[PDB]
Design a binder for this molecule. Structure first.
Ligand SMILES: CCC[C@@]1(CCc2ccccc2)CC(O)=C([C@@H](CC)c2cccc(NS(=O)(=O)c3ccc(C(F)(F)F)cn3)c2)C(=O)O1
Lengths: 99, 99
């Protein structure tokens, strides 16, 4: 659909059999979610943002349903303050910025 | 313009006569720029990011040109890893998320 920016661009996602709420963040290269259990092996990684770095666990080839939209891609799990859907999966669902 | 996200959504801003590179970020509510001087008095503000909170310098009614569009609102100045343009100014340029 079309999303205006008067409010935070919050969407519901589905992952690991858990329905969740996320932020569509176009400034994020990656997708970071609050702590959770995902299947398969993961690697430790460090991602920075406003505030500095947080250690995260990186899961690859993950299926996510955003706005009833399937998408597969890398997902990082860690001590994030908020769930954030990055460009990494935003491209996959054809998201653009218009103005 | 219509901006895709396979690349960072970097744009050129004109701020205080200087051209700068900023990021269009729907995930941020406010505009946070790298350390720089600006006119007037500033109020203090604490902002939370992915990796923690940071104090910043709040500046109101600042003139910022983003891709030719003229905006005038609040600008946070602080230790940010990158110049970020938030919802406060995106709503001003009439920026939406499409899909
Ligand atoms: C201005 C703060 C808002 C925000 C955090 C979001 C938030 C929203 C509501 C409540 C709580 C938190 C959103 C934002 O886009 C990021 C950024 C960097 C600008 C961000 C977000 C997610 C991941 C990262 N790590 S990264 O490797 O994907 C990365 C690293 C750097 C860049 C750069 F282009 F921003 F430098 C972008 N992405 C960074 C952030 O660090 O804080």
């Amino acid at each position: 659909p079309q999303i205006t920016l008067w409010q935070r661009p919050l969407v519901t996602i589905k992952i690991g059999g858990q329905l969740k709420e996320a932020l569509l963040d176009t400034g994020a290269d990656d997708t970071v979610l609050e702590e959770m259990s995902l299947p398969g092996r993961w690697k430790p990684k460090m991602i920075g943002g406003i505030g500095g770095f947080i250690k995260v666990r990186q899961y690859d080839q993950i299926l996510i349903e955003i706005c009833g939209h399937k998408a597969i891609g890398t997902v990082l799990v860690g001590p994030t303050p908020f769930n954030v859907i990055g460009r990494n999966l935003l491209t996959q669902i054809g998201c653009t910025l218009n103005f």
